[PDB]
Design a binder for this molecule. Structure first.
Ligand SMILES: *Cc1c(COP(=O)(O)O)cnc(C)c1O
Ligand SMILES: *Cc1c(COP(=O)(O)O)cnc(C)c1O
Ligand SMILES: O=P(O)(O)OC[C@@H](O)CO
Ligand SMILES: O=P(O)(O)OC[C@@H](O)CO
Ligand code: NA
Ligand code: NA
Lengths: 390, 267, 390, 267
């Protein structure tokens, strides 16, 4: 029995071993209570404003759109403390952990951004943080690993399975299965078992709320579409949530197409995978024909979650949101274009979203359209990657 | 069929508990796993609990993570597991065979089709480790349509509503967890389980098999004395495989010695 | 003849070859005009707000000060676009360049942050940017050099002299001596010939203006002191300017003490150098006994300017501001402390300022004091440096 | 003393322009620089313009940047330069000797003390390259108290107020820049300088020496024809040093050939 519906249509649920169900029910109840609590809301807003730097800017990109009838704005989550939107929801989850009387945080991370985010929130709020990270990811993200440790978190390499994000996800759940009485699991995206998809959307929905107010101020109308990359689905649902009931506003999510969908080396399970049950939820998964879970491939390390949030699968099924994919070369081209024409270095994750906006503009340059791209993070971390390719 | 019911009746007539080993099918290869299983039965196993290799076994500690890695190195697939199961049933007509599965392997090609395949090969029960009672409806319904007992875990943090649900929905046996955490022989449960056991009997639940952390004879006799119908041991068995990979003959001898000892403790 | 006084007491002036004097007079007149122009002010404010992310947060650091009577706030220039305060004044200077009808930008850089800043502003505003950088600095700042080029600037290594910042400063002036009719020299600190000290302060003074309003809102009173690192003097004068007439507010500037003042391996010319004439101005310089200019040494690459802004030398001489120094090990300790206790990674430059605040707190823990440290930049760039030392 | 005035009078009597080479003192070593200077004079230099090595010569192109680097490799200091100057004056009693200095070397140990040292060794003039007229007051005053002519640059972008100031303040000669930019023989000035030259004479300025980019005889004769009193050549001379570092004897021969040619062009 739960307070809120754990499903978005057929997708979602609470597919964890029975021993973890009390922890999920406890978290759901704490969340419902926090959402009606003016003191919790004031505390969250204060950290968002005075620690993280909200509200973030909405930047118009006239150099990019010159000569066309596209007007494009970027929502500047690259300017949030930590360099990516993940900071919003780790602060709310840290506060939920304290509300429940927990003193320890467990988190998983792939590219490391979620681990840095979890470590910074835990340092600020006095929580003891341990992070699980696939050993292959530890090897290729030494900078992030060192940032986590400078912030006082313990980083534990995971060598099982493929030694990447999914295996860190498993290990986090194995730990929580034994430590839930003292530790909160600070999950990194809008996926996993209920209530996580719902809590992560609500702790990211200020992205879309601010965007709406900002665009109304600057243009006096809502966007024709809002566009966001989809790794696990958090930045995209945070941008989409406030516009879901605005039927005229398009919601476009962009999964990584890797080397190309036809090559099979991609990370686009929503449109090109198959529904399965893993990580606590029923959702589209990267998996073999026999049901073994597989990795997502992208030039961008952070779009590596091999499934997708159940709310996105639901919005897709009813046709409220549209999902597309962008390849590695398209993302690289968008990264180069933003640097040169606007002086902003975008994360290679966010570059997928910007690449799809550029295609909408270039393919029909005389179509009048007001677009917002969620610039989910900054790309200083990606310059070596981009340098080596080039 | 009613293999668990026949077993527990027989055992009750001898005032004995069940001893039930777990292994991962195909660890460390198909042929050796078949030999391992025959040895477990010859040495006194009353029933089997068997895993199908999966990419992400989130209820398992390192010992069983490694069994899965070994099975995957051998190329073991679910279809190969089903062929093994058919062969095990053809050799041994009465022993209860239960699967311990992860959800994605059951849901993959259709939940109903999974249970139908289990009935075709002779499996008696299925525990899906990452399906709690709250999500179990399609799994238990499909199990029952195909004469398969759906098994539920009764955790130490179980409340009364959960005990009633477990007792109502489960068949064959109830999986009584020794403790929180994941599988592993290193970590022994020490909580008193007497109350849960009595409550389950009060609610006419399937007989309880205690599992997680059972690695020694005294823990088998303790489980039976507390009122459980038996005990399951997996990591302890699997560790004997892992330590003897280089000597398959010595591996079977040690498995025999251990299962014999654990089974003697249930009498 | 000039419109504004080129001196702060004995310090400052316009010590350039005669051929550059028309360019300085032109710039001074354009600046005076821009400062009275509501359209220029609106345009500058719009870029600061909607492109750069102003206003920046003022963050209270209660974990750091626990157990003492210090209250400490950090002014969050680490959250400005580009990661450091330099972005404020390059945007204003880019706009002055366009106001004068110039289409090209020349800039110098040491650690590279000024070069990245100049490149981003020039990309946004359609200016062609060339950057001079000491070849020894090019070798040790490959990331920054690549960011400049991704943003479309031309980076030209300078091999003369010591092949570091001062030699890039010279080369920039040699170029402008021949190209001033089409190119504006976008100088990187509040130093050099008038009118640069004055323009750079006025294009950074929003740091102190926002701080004042923010502290009055949160505490209902002005700080007992505002504390800032001093490489060339821009972030510090931007923080100090609005408080100069508030006589109760202490102004403390922190130069790098390197390995220790007594070792001679430092970068503290204001308190430990000797007045000279170089880079267009009369100011305290790092120099030998015979008058040859020398380098500044610090663990932080960005506190490398071998002199200091003439306004700081003047504020020191009259005792309105106090200047101190912090060593490499003190800065490293402050960097570690902020990461672990507040989840913020500070630039090693800014860490000098924070280290001096920590000393003010620790040396007299029962003294009641309300302090603001200017957190001039983020320290993600410094993690390798810090990792290698440790 | 009035060495520039005596020179320009003599030259006017022969309808000749002055040819004035520049070198950096101590490039490429003290002894060789002294020999270079004696060769320049023997081959026909009418006056000398001499630089003191400085760490940051911001008015100089690469040729002179390199002369400074060479002098520093030889350990050349300002005090060593002053000793050289005294020695040059002791050998040559009438030739005008002008310094081209950077401000910090003049201000370092006191502006007055610098000019006093120049008077003690026999220097006739000083041009401080990074002191514009607007900042020149303490420099010109100190120069005049020590019988040193303060020299100012008249740039191509000079307005009337600047011409008047230059004419009023300067003594000895006026440095007429050929062009914008920094020193270097590669880049030749081509602007007509006739108007500036006439305006300076109208305002009774010190006689004009054209400098920057003068590297060939035809440019010497062109400067004299336009009305200048002569011409200065530095990078062209310094390049002969740089190209002949390995053969000091050949270096002096080529310097002789070049200065002789440039001086012939002024007649
Ligand atoms: C982690 C990350 C993403 C992907 O995660 P979502 O949950 O899909 O938002 C996207 N952009 C940035 C910058 C990230 O750090
Ligand atoms: C460049 C820089 C400084 C030093 O320059 P100032 O002109 O003294 O402010 C200080 N902090 C940061 C972060 C910088 O990038
Ligand atoms: O003995 P354990 O701890 O591995 O627990 C038993 C499980 O493997 C299987 O039921
Ligand atoms: O001949 P240039 O171009 O080096 O210019 C002359 C200066 O060196 C010295 O007066
Ligand atoms: Na995904
Ligand atoms: Na300095």
């Amino acid at each position: 029995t739960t307070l809120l519906n754990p499903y978005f249509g057929e997708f979602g649920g609470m597919y964890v071993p029975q021993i973890l169900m009390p922890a999920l029910n406890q978290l759901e109840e704490a969340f419902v209570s926090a959402q009606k609590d003016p003191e919790f809301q004031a505390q969250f807003a204060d950290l968002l404003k005075n620690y993280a730097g909200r509200p973030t800017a909405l930047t118009k990109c006239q150099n990019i759109t010159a000569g066309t009838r596209t007007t494009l704005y970027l929502k500047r989550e690259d300017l949030l403390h930590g360099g990516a939107h993940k900071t919003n929801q780790v602060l709310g989850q840290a506060l939920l952990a304290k509300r429940m009387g927990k003193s320890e945080i467990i988190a998983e991370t792939g590219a490391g951004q979620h681990g840095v985010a979890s470590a910074l929130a835990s340092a600020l709020l006095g929580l003891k943080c341990r992070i699980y990270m696939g050993a292959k990811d530890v090897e290729r993200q030494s900078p992030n690993v060192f940032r986590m440790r400078l912030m006082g978190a313990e980083v534990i390499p995971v060598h099982s399975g493929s030694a990447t994000l999914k295996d860190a996800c498993n290990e986090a759940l194995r730990d929580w299965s034994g430590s839930y009485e003292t530790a909160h699991y600070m999950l990194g995206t809008a996926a996993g078992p209920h209530p996580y998809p719902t809590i992560v959307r609500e702790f990211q929905r200020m992205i879309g709320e601010e965007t709406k107010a900002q665009i109304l101020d600057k243009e006096g109308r809502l966007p024709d579409a809002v566009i966001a990359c989809v790794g696990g689905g958090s930045n995209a649902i945070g941008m989409f949530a406030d516009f879901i009931n605005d039927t005229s506003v398009g919601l476009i999510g962009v999964e990584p197409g890797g080397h190309g969908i036809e090559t099979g080396e991609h990370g686009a399970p929503l449109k090109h995978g198959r529904v399965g049950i893993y990580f606590g939820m029923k959702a589209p998964m990267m998996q073999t024909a026999d049901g073994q879970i597989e990795e997502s491939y992208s030039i961008s390390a952070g779009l590596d979650f091999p499934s997708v949030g159940p709310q996105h699968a639901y919005l897709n099924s009813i046709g409220r949101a549209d999902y597309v994919s962008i390849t590695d070369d398209e993302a690289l081209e968008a990264f180069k274009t933003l640097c040169r024409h606007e002086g902003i270095i975008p994360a290679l994750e966010s570059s997928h979203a910007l690449a799809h906006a550029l295609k909408m503009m270039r393919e029909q340059p005389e179509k009048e359209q007001l677009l917002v791209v969620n610039l989910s993070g900054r790309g200083d971390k990606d310059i070596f990657t981009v340098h080596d390719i080039l | 069929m009613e293999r668990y019911e026949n077993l527990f009746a027989q055992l009750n007539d001898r005032r004995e508990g069940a001893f039930v080993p777990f292994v991962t099918l195909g660890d460390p290869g198909i042929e050796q796993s078949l030999k391992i299983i025959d040895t477990l039965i010859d040495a006194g196993a009353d029933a089997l609990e068997l895993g199908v290799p999966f990419s992400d076994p989130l209820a398992d500690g390192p010992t069983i993570q490694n069994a899965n890695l070994r099975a995957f190195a051998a190329g073991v697939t679910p279809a190969q597991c089903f062929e093994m199961l058919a062969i095990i049933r053809e050799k041994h007509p009465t022993i209860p065979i239960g699967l311990l599965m992860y959800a994605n392997l059951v849901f993959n090609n259709g939940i109903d089709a999974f249970y139908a395949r289990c009935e075709q090969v002779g499996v008696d029960s299925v525990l899906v480790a990452d399906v709690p009672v709250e999500e179990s409806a399609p799994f238990r319904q499909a199990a029952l349509r195909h004469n398969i007992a759906p098994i539920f875990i009764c955790p130490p943090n179980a409340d009364d509503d959960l005990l009633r649900q477990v007792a109502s929905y489960g068949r064959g046996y109830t999986y009584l967890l020794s403790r929180s955490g994941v599988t592993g022989a290193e970590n022994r449960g020490a909580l008193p389980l007497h109350h849960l056991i009595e409550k389950l009997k009060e609610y006419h639940a399937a007989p309880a098999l205690q599992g997680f952390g059972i690695s020694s004879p005294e823990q088998v006799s303790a489980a039976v004395r507390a009122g459980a119908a038996g005990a399951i041991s997996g990591s302890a068995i699997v560790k004997i495989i892992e330590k003897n990979l280089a000597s398959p003959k010595q591996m079977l001898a040690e498995l025999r010695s251990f299962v014999s000892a654990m089974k003697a403790a249930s009498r």
